[PDB]
Structure 1
């Protein structure tokens, strides 16, 4: 008895492969109302049709941390900010001074250092330049000259000085990625939704359903709801402190906006440029005043300690408020498309959790209804993108705005985890890890339509 070679075509096989992919997108969120706009650019309208066939008896490996798609769409998308790099106004590429004590407006505002100010040491030192003026809050009063300071325009000292003026759009449109022909996208499913290692009810698609941008330092929001409880994800959960993420059953709300009004006094500044010198004091009495339905927060932590009991046995367990550094590390982050803002995760999140045969001591509170209120910061001059030398003085918007959100998950780190009362904080992570959200469902493969085997059949000669 003996064997020989034979070859087959249409053989069911693929291999995992780095590649680009191309994108479907919303069909009306951009239209002829937004000529040449970056959201209008490139990738195509929406596909209603993504079919599947089942992998009956059949299963596959996954790893959300290893997968390349995080880079695929960390690339492309940030080029909105590259398109947004408008030139500096003629008055302020240099570190100009400003003069004020109370505001140049009719009063300084009801809350904090809003003491609006004229430019003064301003190129020509001339009325055409020094008549022009800015909204104030905080970083705008930084020291220049001596005591009785003529305050620093801080935006000069970094490689890019710019503003993304209000014509630019930031709407979190759902992209629907599809792989090139002969590639395919495989979707993992089981109630064991862990997102690394083997997966059982694995499934096939030409394209993903829609997934949306997000821009948070600590609390993920406004997107993909979980499958029916809560779960935690990590690269190697045995690790001391390496970043952890938590995914939520029920979208607990954040109930606030900062409707402090300043009027639409934009200016065709200098040699025919544009600037947003918003002034006057109608509607000036107003603040962020933020609030949350406490029980709908409380449920998560009081369940989460049980979940953590599976990963870290019997110990008392703890969260503490967010880590120090800049306000951004010190906070959860958002902008409505109206003002840049940073809430105090460094006061909140302070709870310990008992975990013996426990029936006690795991929360903020129990049995009150009531809800809660919380306080939060603003930063109107921003290192507008982290990890780049780019900075902007933000363009304001009038009145209240159509904004509020609800939370899909936590970004998390296990700070201090070498002693009992096993400790954690909100925050950590790469800016990339926003886009981990839902993407644990997927991997990309290349088809390989032929293969070779032994047989008993000896060929003709």
Structure 2
């Protein structure tokens, strides 16, 4: 009795919903004269501080494998390459027949994996064309059927190629996501949260922490570390269609280097356009390699097997190397120093486990490639201009994109190789969630409005 409606505003309640999220960048955006790296050129807003505000007693549901933020991350990452390759030179005039032979390093020693090609190209005057020459990797070249001296660029019979502008060199600059006014980006602080199910220590923020837009295939490198011990995530660990994102609490250092120099030479394609190819190769014959502290890898694989068999305590666990086929899918990949590696990781995933640091470094030999059919797109390609000087690179492994195979034996199988590239960014945005606030409410109380 004597209860009437009363309307509140500013009620703290929310409901899940998708929205368009800002893109931001650190106020330390770019320092090489701010020559328009995609993060600084597009994600203009500067350093929104994450003023985290814990929530006393909230119990909130999370679901990483179907959240709204990952798709936006993938779309932005794909689209930010198109907005930067558009002005660069097209290599359409270069898709001509090539008369190509073997290359030779110093002392006339044949160099494996290279071929000295010569081709006809139009000069500044459109009536004249001359016979230039440059050196292509064997993986940028497909032999024209029949004669052994005729070749053609691998990609220029399916799609157009565009050289990457050297002035906009790509780098993993961190990216901050901030929900627009009216929304709120929650997140979970439970330091053993398994990626799905409720979290009892939710908190909100203006924006996500700096997220590196790394690109890689099977070692999820330069990531962030878990705060507890090794964690394992999957929508259904049993089902093979789902990538088993293993997340490391112990970074394992990995080095990769290219021990010889490259001669960058400029070939003019026409009015005001330059095409940088690789001339003579300087230095001795080598294959770019990578190093890992064998003690640390032994320990980390022991730990991952220990954690993984808690879900399969009955039987042994066997790791296996990549199956085989296209280098694009069967090899750990990255872009250290502006040149794309492609490493063979068969030697790192052959250890097996049964039921019940500067020493012994492991080495793995890595190919290199220039014409990248970027993972971000199919039906188009890119050309990475050669980089002078030997390139050394150091990074911290912080995860594995395993996946389980159907071995005939009676024990478990896990081999590297993810099924999609979204899993790279789903190892950083597994905490967050985005909700829309509904600050209007109605409740009963002991009041009725005045009559005057």
Cα pair distance change 1:104/1:299, threshold 3 Å: closer
Please give the secondary structure, in 2, of the residue aligned with 1:78. Answer: helix
Bigger shift: 256-265 or 182-191? Answer: 256-265
Q: In structure 1, what is the Cα distance between the partners aligned to 2:372 and 2:270?
A: 24
Unpaired runs of 5+ residues, structure 1, are: 354-359
Structure 1: distance between partners of 2:386 and 2:80: 20
Q: Which residue of 1 aligns with 2:420?
A: 430
Length, aligned pairs only = 451
Corresponding position of 2:396:
406
Is the contact made by 1:322 and 1:347 (CA closer than 8 Å) also made in structure 2?
no
Residue 43 (structure 2) aligns with: 43
Residue 338 of structure 2 corresponds to which residue in structure 1?
338
Contact 1:87 1:162 in 2 (8 A): no
The corresponding residue for 1:12 is 12
- In 2 relative to 1, CA 131–237 (structure 1 residues): closer, same or farther, beyond 3 Å? same
**Which residue of structure 1 aligns with residue 306 of structure 2?**
306
Quickly say closer, same or farther: Cα 1:279–1:413, change in 2 above 3 A: same
Residues 230 and 249 of structure 2 are in contact (CA less than 8 Å); yes or no, is this contact kept in structure 1?
A: yes
Question: 1:357 maps to which residue?
Answer: none
How large is the Cα RMSD of the aligned pairs?
A: 3.2
- CA separation of 1:283 and 1:7: change in aligned 2, threshold 3 A: same
CA gap 1:230/1:11 in 2 versus in 1, 3 angstroms: same
What's the secondary structure of 2:53's corresponding residue?
Answer: coil
Going from structure 1 to structure 2, the CA distance change for 1:202 and 1:418 (only over 3 Å counts) comes to farther
Asked if 2 retains the 8 angstrom alpha-carbon contact of 1:260 and 1:398, the reply is no
Tell whether the 8 Å contact from 2:37 to 2:170 is kept in structure 1 after alignment.
no
- The structure in which a higher percent of residues are strand is 2
Question: Relative to structure 1, is the Cα distance of residues 251 and 131 closer, same or farther in structure 2, using a 3 angstrom cutoff?
Answer: same
- Please report how far the alpha carbon of residue 386 of structure 1 lies from its aligned counterpart in structure 2 after TM superposition: 4.6
**2:267 touches 2:275 (CA, 8 Å); kept in 1?**
yes
What does the per-residue CA deviation read over 1:395-444, in whole Å, with 9 as the maximum and x for residues that have no partner?
10111235221101111111116752210111123112111122111101
Alpha-carbon separation, structure 1, partners of 2:105 and 2:32: 39
Asked if 2 retains the 8 angstrom alpha-carbon contact of 1:110 and 1:284, the reply is: no
1:35-74 CA deviation, whole Å, 9 max, x = no partner?
4553331223543732233222322110111211111122
Note if contact 1:89-1:270 (Cα within 8 Å) is conserved in structure 2. no
- Give CA deviations for 1:113-164 in whole Å, capped at 9, x if unaligned: 3122101598999995442222222134422152233112233212322111
2:15 alignment partner, SS class: strand
Give the TM-score normalised by the residue count of structure 1: 0.88
Question: Using the alignment, how far apart are the partners of 1:53 and 1:18 within structure 2?
Answer: 22
Question: Is the 1:26–1:174 Cα contact (8 Å) retained in structure 2?
Answer: yes
**1: CA distance, partners of 2:331 / 2:101:** 30
- CA deviations on 1:311-343 (whole Å, 9 max, x unpaired) are 123111111002322012110001124322111
CA pair 334-49 structure 1, distance change in 2 beyond 3 A: closer
Q: Which TM-score applies when normalising by structure 2?
A: 0.89
Query: Matches of 1:149 and 1:398 in 2, distance apart?
Result: 28
On the 8 A contact 2:305/2:317 being kept in 1, the answer is: yes
Find the aligned partners of 2:439 and 2:94 in 1 and give their Cα distance.
Answer: 62
Cα distance in 2, alignment partners of residues 39 and 96 from structure 1: 36
Aligned-partner Cα distance in 2 for 1:108–1:242: 51
Q: Contact 1:139–1:379 (CA<8 Å) still a contact in 2?
A: yes
Give the deviation of 1:346 after TM superposition: 3.8
Q: Is the 8 A contact 2:135 2:280 kept in 1?
A: no
Cα 1:267–1:147 shift into 2, 3 Å: closer
Q: Deviations for 1:152-185, whole angstroms, at most 9, x for unmatched residues? A: 2233212322111322221111112111112111
Find the aligned partners of 1:115 and 1:247 in 2 and give their Cα distance: 41
In the superposition, relative to structure 1, how do residues 154 and 52 fare at CA in structure 2: closer, same or farther (>3 Å)?
A: closer
Structure 2 portions without partners, runs of 5+:
none
Q: Is the 8 A contact 1:175 1:212 kept in 2?
A: yes
Q: 1:211 to 1:38 in 2, by over 3 A?
A: closer
Moved more, 88-97 or 120-129: 120-129
Q: Is the 8 A contact 2:329 2:417 kept in 1?
A: yes
Shift of 1:272: 3.5
Shift of 1:81: 2.1
Q: 2:167 aligns to what SS in structure 1?
A: coil
Distance 1:278 1:29, change over 3 A: farther
Give the stretch that moved more between structures: 138-147 or 154-163: 138-147
Once the two structures are overlaid, the 10-residue window that deviates more, 176-185 or 107-116, is 107-116
- C-alpha separation in 2, matches of 1:76 and 1:293: 36
CA distance in 2, matches of 1:135, 1:276: 11
Alpha-carbon spacing, 1:196–1:90, altered in 2? closer, same or farther (3 Å): closer
Distance 1:46 1:121 in 2: 46
